[PDB]
Structure formats: structure tokens, C-alpha cells
mmCIF file of C-alpha atoms in Angstrom:
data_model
loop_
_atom_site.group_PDB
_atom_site.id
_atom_site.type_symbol
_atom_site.label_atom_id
_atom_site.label_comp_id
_atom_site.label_asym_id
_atom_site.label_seq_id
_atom_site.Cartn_x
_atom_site.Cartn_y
_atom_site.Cartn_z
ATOM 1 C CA UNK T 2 -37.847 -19.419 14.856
ATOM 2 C CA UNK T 3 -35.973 -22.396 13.589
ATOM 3 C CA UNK T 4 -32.599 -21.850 12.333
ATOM 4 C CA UNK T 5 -33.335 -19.337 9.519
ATOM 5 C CA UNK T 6 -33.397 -16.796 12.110
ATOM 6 C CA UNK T 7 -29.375 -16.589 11.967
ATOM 7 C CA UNK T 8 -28.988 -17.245 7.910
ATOM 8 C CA UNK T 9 -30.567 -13.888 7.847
ATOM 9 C CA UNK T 10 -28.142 -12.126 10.584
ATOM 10 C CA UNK T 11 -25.142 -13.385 8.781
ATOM 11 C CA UNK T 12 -26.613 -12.403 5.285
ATOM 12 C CA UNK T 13 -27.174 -9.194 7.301
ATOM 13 C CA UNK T 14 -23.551 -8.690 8.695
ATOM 14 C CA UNK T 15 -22.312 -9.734 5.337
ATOM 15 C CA UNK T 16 -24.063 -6.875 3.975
ATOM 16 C CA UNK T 17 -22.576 -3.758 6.564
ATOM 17 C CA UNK T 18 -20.027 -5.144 5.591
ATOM 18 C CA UNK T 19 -19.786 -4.608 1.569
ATOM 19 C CA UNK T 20 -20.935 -0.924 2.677
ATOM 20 C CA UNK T 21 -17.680 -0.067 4.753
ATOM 21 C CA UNK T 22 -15.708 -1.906 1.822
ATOM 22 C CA UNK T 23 -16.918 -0.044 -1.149
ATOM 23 C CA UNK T 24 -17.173 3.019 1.129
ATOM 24 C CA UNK T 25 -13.374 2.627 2.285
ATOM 25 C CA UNK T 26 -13.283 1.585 -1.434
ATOM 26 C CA UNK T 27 -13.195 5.735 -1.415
ATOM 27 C CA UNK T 28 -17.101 5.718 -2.805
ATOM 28 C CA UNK T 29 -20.196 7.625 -1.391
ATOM 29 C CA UNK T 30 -21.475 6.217 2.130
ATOM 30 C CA UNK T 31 -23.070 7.566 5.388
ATOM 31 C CA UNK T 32 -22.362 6.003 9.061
ATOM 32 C CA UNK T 33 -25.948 5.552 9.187
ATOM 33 C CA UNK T 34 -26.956 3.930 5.665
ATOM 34 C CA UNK T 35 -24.143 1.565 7.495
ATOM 35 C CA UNK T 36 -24.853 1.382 11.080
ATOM 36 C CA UNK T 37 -28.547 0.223 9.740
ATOM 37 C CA UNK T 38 -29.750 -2.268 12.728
ATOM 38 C CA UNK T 39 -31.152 -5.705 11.904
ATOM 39 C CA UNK T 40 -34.296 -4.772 13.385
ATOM 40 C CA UNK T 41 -34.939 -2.278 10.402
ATOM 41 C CA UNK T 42 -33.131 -4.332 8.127
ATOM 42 C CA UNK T 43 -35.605 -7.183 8.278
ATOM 43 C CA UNK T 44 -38.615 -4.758 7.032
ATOM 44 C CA UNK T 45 -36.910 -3.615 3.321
ATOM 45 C CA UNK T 46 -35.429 -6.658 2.125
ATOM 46 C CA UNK T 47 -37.923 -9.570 3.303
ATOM 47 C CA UNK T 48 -40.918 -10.773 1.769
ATOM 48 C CA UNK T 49 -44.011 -12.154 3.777
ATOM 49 C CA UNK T 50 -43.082 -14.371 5.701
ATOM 50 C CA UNK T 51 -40.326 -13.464 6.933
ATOM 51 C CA UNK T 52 -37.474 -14.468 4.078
ATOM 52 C CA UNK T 53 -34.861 -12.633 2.405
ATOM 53 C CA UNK T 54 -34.934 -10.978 -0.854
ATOM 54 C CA UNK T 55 -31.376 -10.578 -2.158
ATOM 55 C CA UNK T 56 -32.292 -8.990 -6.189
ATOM 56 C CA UNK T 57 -33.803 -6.250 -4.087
ATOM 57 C CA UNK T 58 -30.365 -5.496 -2.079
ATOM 58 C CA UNK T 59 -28.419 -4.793 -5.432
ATOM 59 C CA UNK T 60 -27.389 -0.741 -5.790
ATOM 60 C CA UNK T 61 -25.252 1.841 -7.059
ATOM 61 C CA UNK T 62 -22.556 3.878 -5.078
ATOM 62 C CA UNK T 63 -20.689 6.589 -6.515
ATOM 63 C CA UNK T 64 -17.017 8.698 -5.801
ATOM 64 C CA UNK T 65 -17.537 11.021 -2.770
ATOM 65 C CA UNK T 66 -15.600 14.294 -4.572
ATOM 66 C CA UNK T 67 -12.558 13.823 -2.210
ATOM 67 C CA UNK T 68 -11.647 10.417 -3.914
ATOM 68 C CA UNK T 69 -12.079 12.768 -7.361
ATOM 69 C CA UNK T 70 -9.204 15.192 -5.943
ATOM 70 C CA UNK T 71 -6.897 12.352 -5.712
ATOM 71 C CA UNK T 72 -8.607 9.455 -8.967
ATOM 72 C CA UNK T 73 -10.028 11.635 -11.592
ATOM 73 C CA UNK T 74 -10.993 8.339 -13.627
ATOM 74 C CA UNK T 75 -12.474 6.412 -11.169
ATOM 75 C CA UNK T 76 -15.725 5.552 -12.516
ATOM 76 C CA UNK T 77 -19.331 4.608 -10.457
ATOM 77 C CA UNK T 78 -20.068 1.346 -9.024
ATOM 78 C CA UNK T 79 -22.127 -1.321 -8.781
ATOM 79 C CA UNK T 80 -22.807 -4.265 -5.983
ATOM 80 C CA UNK T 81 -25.456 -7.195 -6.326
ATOM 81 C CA UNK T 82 -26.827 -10.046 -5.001
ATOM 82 C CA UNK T 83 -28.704 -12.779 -5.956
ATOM 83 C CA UNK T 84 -31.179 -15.409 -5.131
ATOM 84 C CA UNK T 85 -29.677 -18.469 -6.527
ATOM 85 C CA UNK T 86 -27.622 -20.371 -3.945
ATOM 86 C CA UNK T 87 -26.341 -22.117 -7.049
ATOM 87 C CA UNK T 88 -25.431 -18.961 -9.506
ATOM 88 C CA UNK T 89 -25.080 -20.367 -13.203
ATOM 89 C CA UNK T 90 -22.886 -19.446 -16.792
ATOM 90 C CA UNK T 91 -26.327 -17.880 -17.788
ATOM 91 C CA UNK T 92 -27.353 -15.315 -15.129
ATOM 92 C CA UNK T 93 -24.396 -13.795 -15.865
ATOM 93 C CA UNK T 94 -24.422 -12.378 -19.146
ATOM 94 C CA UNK T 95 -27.288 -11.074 -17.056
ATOM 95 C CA UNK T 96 -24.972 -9.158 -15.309
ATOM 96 C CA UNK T 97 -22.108 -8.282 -17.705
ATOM 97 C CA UNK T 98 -24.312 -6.493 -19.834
ATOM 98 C CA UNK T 99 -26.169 -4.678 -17.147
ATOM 99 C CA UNK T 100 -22.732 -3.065 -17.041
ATOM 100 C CA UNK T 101 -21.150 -2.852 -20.593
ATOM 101 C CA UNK T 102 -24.173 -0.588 -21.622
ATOM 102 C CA UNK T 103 -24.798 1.607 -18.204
ATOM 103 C CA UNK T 104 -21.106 2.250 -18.989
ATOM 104 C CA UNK T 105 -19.424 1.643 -15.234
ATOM 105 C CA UNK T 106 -16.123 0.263 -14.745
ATOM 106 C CA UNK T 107 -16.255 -1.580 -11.518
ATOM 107 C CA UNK T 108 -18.401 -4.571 -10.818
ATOM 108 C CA UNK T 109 -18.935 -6.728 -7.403
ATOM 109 C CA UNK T 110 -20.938 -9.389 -7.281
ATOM 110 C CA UNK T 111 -21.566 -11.797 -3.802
ATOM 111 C CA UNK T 112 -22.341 -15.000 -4.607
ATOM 112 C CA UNK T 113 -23.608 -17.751 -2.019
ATOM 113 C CA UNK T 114 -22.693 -21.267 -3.093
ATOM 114 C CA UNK T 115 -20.600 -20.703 -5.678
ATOM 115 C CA UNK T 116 -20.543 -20.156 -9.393
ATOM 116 C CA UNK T 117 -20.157 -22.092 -12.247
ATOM 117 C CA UNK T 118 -16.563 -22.581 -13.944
ATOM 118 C CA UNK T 119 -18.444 -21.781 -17.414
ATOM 119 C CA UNK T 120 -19.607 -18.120 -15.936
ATOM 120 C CA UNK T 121 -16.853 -16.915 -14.199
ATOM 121 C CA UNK T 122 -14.768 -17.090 -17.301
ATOM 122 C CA UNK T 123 -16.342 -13.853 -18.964
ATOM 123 C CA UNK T 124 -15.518 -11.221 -16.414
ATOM 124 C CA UNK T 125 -12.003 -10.471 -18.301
ATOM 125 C CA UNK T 126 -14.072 -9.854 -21.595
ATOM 126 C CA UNK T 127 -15.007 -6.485 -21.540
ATOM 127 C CA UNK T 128 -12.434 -3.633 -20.676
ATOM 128 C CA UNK T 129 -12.057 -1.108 -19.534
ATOM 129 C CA UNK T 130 -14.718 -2.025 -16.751
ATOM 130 C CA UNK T 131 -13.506 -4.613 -14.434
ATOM 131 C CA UNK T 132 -15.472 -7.301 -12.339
ATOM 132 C CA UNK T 133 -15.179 -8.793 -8.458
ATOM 133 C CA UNK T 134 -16.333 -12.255 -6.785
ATOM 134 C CA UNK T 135 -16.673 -12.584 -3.392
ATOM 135 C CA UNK T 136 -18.195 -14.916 -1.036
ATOM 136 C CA UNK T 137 -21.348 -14.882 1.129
ATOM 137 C CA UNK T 138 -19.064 -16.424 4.248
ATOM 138 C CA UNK T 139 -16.379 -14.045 3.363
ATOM 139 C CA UNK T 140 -17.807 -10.657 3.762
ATOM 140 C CA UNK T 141 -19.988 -11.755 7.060
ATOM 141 C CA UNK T 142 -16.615 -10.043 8.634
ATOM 142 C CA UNK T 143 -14.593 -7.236 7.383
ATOM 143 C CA UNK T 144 -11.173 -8.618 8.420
ATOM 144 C CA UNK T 145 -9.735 -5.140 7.894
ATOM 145 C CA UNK T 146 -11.198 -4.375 11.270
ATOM 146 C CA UNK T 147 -8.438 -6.855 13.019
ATOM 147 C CA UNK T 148 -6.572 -5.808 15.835
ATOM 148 C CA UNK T 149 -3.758 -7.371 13.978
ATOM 149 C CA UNK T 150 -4.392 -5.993 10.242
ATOM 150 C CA UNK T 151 -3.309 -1.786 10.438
ATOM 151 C CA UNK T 152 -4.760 0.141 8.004
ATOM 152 C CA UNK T 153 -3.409 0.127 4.054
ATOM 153 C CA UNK T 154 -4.258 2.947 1.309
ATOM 154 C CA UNK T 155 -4.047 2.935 -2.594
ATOM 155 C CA UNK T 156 -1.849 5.028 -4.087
ATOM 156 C CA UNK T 157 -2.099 7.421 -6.747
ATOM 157 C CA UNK T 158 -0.177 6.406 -9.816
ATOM 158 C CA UNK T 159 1.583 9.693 -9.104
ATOM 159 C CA UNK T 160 2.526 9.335 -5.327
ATOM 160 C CA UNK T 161 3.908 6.490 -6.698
ATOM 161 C CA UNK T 162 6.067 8.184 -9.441
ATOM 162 C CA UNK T 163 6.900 10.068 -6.042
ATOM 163 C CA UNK T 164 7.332 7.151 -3.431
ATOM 164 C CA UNK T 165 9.923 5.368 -6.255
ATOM 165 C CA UNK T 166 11.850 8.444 -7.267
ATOM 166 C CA UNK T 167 12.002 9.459 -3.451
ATOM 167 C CA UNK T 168 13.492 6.113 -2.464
ATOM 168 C CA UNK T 169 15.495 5.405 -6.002
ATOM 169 C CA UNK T 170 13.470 2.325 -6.047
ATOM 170 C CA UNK T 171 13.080 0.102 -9.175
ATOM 171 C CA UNK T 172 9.529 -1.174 -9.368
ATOM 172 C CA UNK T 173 10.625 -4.347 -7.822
ATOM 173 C CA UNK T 174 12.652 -3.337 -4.976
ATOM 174 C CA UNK T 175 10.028 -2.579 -3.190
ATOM 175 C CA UNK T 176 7.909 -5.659 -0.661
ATOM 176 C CA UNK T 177 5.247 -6.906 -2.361
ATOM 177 C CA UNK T 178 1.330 -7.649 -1.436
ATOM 178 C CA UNK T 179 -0.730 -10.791 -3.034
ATOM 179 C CA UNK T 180 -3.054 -9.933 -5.910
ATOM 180 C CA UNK T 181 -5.464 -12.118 -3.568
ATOM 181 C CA UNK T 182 -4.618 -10.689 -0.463
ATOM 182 C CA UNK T 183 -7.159 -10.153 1.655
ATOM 183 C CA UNK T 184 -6.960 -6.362 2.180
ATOM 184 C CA UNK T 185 -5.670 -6.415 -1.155
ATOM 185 C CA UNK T 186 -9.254 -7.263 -2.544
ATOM 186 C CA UNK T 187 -10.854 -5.755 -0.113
ATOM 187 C CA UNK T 188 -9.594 -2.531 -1.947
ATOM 188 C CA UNK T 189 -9.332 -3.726 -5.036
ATOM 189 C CA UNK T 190 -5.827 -3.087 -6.368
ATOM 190 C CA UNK T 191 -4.586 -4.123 -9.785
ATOM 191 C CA UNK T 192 -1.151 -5.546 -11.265
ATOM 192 C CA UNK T 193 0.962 -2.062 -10.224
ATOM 193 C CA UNK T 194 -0.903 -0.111 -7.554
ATOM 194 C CA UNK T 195 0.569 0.380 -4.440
ATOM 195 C CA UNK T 196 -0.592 0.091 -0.843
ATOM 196 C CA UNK T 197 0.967 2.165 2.240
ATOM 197 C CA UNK T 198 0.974 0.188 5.226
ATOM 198 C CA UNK T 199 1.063 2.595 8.029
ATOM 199 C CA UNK T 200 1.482 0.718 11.159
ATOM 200 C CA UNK T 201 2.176 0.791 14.817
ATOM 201 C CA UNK T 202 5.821 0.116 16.400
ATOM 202 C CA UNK T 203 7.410 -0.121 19.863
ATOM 203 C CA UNK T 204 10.042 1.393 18.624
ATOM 204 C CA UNK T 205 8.478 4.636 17.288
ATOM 205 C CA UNK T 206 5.184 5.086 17.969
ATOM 206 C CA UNK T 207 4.270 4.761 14.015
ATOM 207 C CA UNK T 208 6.005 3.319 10.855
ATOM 208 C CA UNK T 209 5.113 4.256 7.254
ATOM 209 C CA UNK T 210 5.852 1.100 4.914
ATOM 210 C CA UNK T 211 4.890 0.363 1.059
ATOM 211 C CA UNK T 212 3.720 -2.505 -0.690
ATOM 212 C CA UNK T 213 3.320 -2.748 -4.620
ATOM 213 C CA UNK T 214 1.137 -5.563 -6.161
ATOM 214 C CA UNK T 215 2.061 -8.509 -7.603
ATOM 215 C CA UNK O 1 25.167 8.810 -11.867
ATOM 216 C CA UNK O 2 26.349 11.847 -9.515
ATOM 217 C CA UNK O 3 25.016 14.402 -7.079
ATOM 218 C CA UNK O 4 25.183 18.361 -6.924
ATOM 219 C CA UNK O 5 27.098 19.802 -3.799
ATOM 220 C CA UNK O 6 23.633 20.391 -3.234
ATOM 221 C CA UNK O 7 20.754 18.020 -3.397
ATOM 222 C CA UNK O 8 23.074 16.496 -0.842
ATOM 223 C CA UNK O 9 21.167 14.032 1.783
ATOM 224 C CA UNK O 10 23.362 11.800 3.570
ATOM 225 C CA UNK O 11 24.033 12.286 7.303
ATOM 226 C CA UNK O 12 26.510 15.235 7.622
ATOM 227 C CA UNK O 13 28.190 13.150 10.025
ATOM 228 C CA UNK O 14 31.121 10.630 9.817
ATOM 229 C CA UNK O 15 30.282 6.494 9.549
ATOM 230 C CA UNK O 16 32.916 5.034 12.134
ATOM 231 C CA UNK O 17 33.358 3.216 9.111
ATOM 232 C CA UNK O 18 34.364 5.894 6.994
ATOM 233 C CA UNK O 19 36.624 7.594 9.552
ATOM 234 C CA UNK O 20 38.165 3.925 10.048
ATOM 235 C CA UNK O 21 39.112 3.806 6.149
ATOM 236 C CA UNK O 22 40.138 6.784 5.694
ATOM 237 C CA UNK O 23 42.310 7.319 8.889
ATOM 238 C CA UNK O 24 43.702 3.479 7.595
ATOM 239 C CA UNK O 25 44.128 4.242 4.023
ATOM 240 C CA UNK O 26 46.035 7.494 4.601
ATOM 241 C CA UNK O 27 48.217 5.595 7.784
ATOM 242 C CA UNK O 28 48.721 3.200 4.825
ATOM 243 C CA UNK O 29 49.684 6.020 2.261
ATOM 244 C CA UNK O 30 51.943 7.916 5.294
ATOM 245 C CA UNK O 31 54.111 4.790 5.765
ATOM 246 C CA UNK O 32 54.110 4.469 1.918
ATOM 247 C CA UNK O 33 56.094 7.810 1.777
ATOM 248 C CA UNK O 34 53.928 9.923 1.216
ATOM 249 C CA UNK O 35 53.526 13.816 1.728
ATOM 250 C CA UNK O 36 51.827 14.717 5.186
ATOM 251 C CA UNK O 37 50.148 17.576 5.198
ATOM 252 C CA UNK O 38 50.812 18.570 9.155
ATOM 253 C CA UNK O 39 54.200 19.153 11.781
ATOM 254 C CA UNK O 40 55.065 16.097 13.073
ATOM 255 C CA UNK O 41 54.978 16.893 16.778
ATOM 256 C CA UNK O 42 57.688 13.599 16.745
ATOM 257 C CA UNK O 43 55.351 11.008 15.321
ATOM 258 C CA UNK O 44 56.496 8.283 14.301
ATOM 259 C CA UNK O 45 53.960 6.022 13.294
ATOM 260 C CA UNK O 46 51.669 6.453 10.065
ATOM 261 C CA UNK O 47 48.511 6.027 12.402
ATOM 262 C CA UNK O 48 49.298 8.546 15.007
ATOM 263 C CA UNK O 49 50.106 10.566 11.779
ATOM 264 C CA UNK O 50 46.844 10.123 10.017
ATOM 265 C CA UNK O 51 45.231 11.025 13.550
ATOM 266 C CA UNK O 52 46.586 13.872 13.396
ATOM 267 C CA UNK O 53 46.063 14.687 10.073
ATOM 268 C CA UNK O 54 43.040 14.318 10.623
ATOM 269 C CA UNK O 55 41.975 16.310 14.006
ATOM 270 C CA UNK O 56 43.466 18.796 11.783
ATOM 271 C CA UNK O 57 41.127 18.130 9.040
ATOM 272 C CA UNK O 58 43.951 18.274 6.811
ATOM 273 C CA UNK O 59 43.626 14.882 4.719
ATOM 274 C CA UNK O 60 43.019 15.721 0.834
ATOM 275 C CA UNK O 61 40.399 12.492 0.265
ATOM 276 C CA UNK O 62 36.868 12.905 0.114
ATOM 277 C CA UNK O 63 34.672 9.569 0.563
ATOM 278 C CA UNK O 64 32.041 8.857 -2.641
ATOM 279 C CA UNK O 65 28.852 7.689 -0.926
ATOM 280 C CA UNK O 66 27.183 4.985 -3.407
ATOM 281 C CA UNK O 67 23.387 4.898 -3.167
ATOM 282 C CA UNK O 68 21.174 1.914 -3.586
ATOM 283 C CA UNK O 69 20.349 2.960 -7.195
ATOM 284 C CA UNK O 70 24.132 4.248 -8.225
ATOM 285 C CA UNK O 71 24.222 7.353 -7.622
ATOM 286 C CA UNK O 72 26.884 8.529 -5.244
ATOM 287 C CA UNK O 73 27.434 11.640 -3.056
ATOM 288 C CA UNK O 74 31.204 13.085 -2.359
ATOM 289 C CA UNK O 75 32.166 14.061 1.124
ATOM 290 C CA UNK O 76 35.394 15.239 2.380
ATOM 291 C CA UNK O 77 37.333 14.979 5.242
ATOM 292 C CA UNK O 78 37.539 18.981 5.817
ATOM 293 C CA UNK O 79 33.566 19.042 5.682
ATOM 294 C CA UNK O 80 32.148 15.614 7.607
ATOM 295 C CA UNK O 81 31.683 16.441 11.319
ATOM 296 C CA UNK O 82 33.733 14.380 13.270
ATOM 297 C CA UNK O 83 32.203 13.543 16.541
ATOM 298 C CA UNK O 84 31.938 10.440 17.854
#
């Protein structure tokens, strides 16, 4: 078996994972096209012998019509992978473009080594879309599933309007989350949106709080 | 930046606080000469004045209740329910 058998498991866990995220993300997802077993997993994205085949994991997910109630302009999405432990400035424009003509607006990509300084610098060149960069190692868990971390939300920007006028709150009265916070990628948010931390408290059982992003 | 009669939101009761003030201020004011409002039953000191005055909700201030953001509410001492 060797010790390939487990670079595949993680690779596997890492995946489930970027389901429930761009799921939670409010996009299109069933239980089961999550709760997919390794057993089946193995036969889909392997070769012959037995090896992984990551530019065949790559797909599309799209707004269940809830999340269209609530974010009329929240456009499709798009996840990939790739086979290059080393990712490089060229595969990229590989990518960007894939984008700028399908016309999306948000783009993950899970790198495994990590990328070169000369790529990364052209995500921020084509708006409106926007682009994401996470890990291999990072996704293997979904933190947000920590006894400790209590569930956050995005806000529309009108329960916003709401939330401020309803507390007379000037944009920056209110506590503050990390543009790289954890939970705070792991949903995405931008310089404005808003999180609602709804937690639980000994002192009453729950205990709405806010968060904007800095 | 002020607040209808209505639209009001603060508690409907009395801050220990505000009670405090006031029933100080108008002791103050009482001893300063100044009108009261109620029969003396033989008091003779401001305080035990402004008590009065004030289980008699008879005390002509009403407390401005700033907000955060500036805007204030007005309460008086006729309406605010004092318990405590």
C-alpha cells in the first residue's frame, strides 16, 4: 500500500470539505454528492493504477433559489484543482480566462505546494469576478465544524442598512472580523459585509452578536 | 437629534441613577428657595422635601436620555414608574 494510500484520504477529506464550504457558501449541494465515501471516491477520480486525477475534480456549482431570495447578484461558481504540486505564473492565465469569458464572478482554486509570487498577482485584474486561494492542508478540515467556532452568516447589504440603523451604529462601532479570518474565508466576505455570530451563553441560552469586515 | 413622544424605547422605568439626580438636584433647588410644589407635612429638610415631591410625582423636570448616536429621549418625573 505504501504511504500513498493516505495522500489520497486527505486529498479526499480535503475535497468534502470544499463541498460543505461552497454549499454553506449558499450554492447548490446535496448531503449525498457530499457524504460520497472514499470507497466510491477512489473509482471517478483515479487513473490505473490507483493515483489521483485532480483536472478531473474541477466543477461548477450554482445559487440554490433560496440564496436568490436574499443575493439577487450572486453569480455561479467555479472550484478546481490541479496536478502540479508546484502551480506556476503560467497555468494561470489558464485559469483567469477560463473565467473572464464564461462570465462568473467567483473563482476558488486549491493549490498543493504553493504558487508562484509572479501568478498570484493577477487575480485582482479582472472585476467584477473575484478569485480565492486556498491550501491542500487547509481544507483537509472544515474548522467551521469546531465545537468551539458557532455558526456565522453573511448579511445582506440591506439587513445591514437594518442592523446599523436599528442599533444607531456608525460603520465602525461595530466588532470587527479579519479579512483572513478563518470563517471569514471560509465564506468569503469582502471589505463591508457583515457576519452574525449567533452563539451559545450560560447566561441565556443564545446570544445574537455582529461582526463587520475589516 | 430628538425623539417623538412616540418612537419612544427606553425602559419605562426609573435608573436609580436618575431618581438619585433628580431627587438631589431638586433637594438642591428646595434649599435654594425655591417653589415646592406639595404641603409640607413639617419638613424641614430639602431631601425629605424632594421625597416627597416626588412620591407625589409632583417635580416639574423631565430627564433627556442621550443615546449612543445623539439622539435623546425626554422622560418626566410624572410618567417614569417608580419602583424600586
Amino acid at each position: 500500500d505504501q504511504e500513498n494510500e493516505r495522500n489520497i484520504s486527505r486529498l479526499w477529506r480535503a475535497f468534502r470539505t470544499v463541498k460543505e464550504m461552497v454549499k454553506d457558501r449558499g450554492y447548490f449541494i446535496t448531503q449525498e454528492e457530499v457524504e460520497l465515501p472514499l470507497e466510491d471516491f477512489k473509482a471517478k477520480y483515479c487513473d490505473s493504477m490507483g493515483r489521483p486525477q485532480r483536472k478531473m475534480m474541477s466543477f461548477q456549482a450554482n445559487p440554490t433559489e433560496e440564496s436568490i431570495s436574499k443575493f439577487p447578484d450572486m453569480g455561479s461558481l467555479w472550484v478546481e484543482f490541479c496536478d502540479e504540486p508546484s502551480v506556476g505564473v503560467k497555468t494561470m492565465k489558464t485559469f483567469v480566462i477560463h473565467i473572464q469569458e464564461k462570465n462568473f464572478q467567483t473563482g476558488i482554486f486549491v493549490y498543493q505546494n504553493n504558487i508562484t509570487p509572479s501568478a498570484m498577482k493577477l487575480v485582482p485584474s479582472i472585476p467584477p469576478a473575484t478569485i480565492e486561494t486556498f491550501n491542500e492542508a487547509a481544507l483537509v478540515v472544515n474548522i467551521t465544524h469546531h465545537e468551539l467556532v458557532p455558526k456565522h452568516i453573511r448579511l445582506s447589504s440591506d439587513e445591514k442598512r437594518e442592523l446599523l440603523k436599528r442599533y444607531r451604529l456608525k460603520e465602525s462601532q461595530l466588532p470587527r472580523i479579519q479579512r483572513a479570518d478563518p470563517v471569514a474565508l471560509y465564506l468569503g466576505l469582502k471589505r463591508g459585509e457583515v457576519v452574525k455570530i449567533i452563539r451559545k451563553s450560560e447566561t441565556s441560552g443564545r446570544y445574537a452578536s455582529y461582526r463587520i469586515c475589516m | 437629534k430628538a425623539i417623538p413622544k412616540d418612537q419612544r424605547a427606553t425602559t419605562p422605568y426609573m435608573t436609580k441613577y436618575e431618581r438619585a439626580r433628580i431627587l438631589g438636584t431638586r433637594a438642591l433647588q428646595i434649599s435654594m428657595n425655591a417653589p415646592v410644589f406639595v404641603d409640607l407635612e413639617g419638613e424641614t429638610d430639602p431631601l425629605r422635601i424632594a421625597m416627597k415631591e416626588l412620591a407625589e410625582k409632583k417635580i416639574p423636570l423631565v430627564i433627556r436620555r442621550y443615546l449612543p448616536d445623539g439622539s435623546f429621549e425626554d422622560w418626566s418625573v410624572e410618567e417614569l414608574i417608580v419602583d424600586l
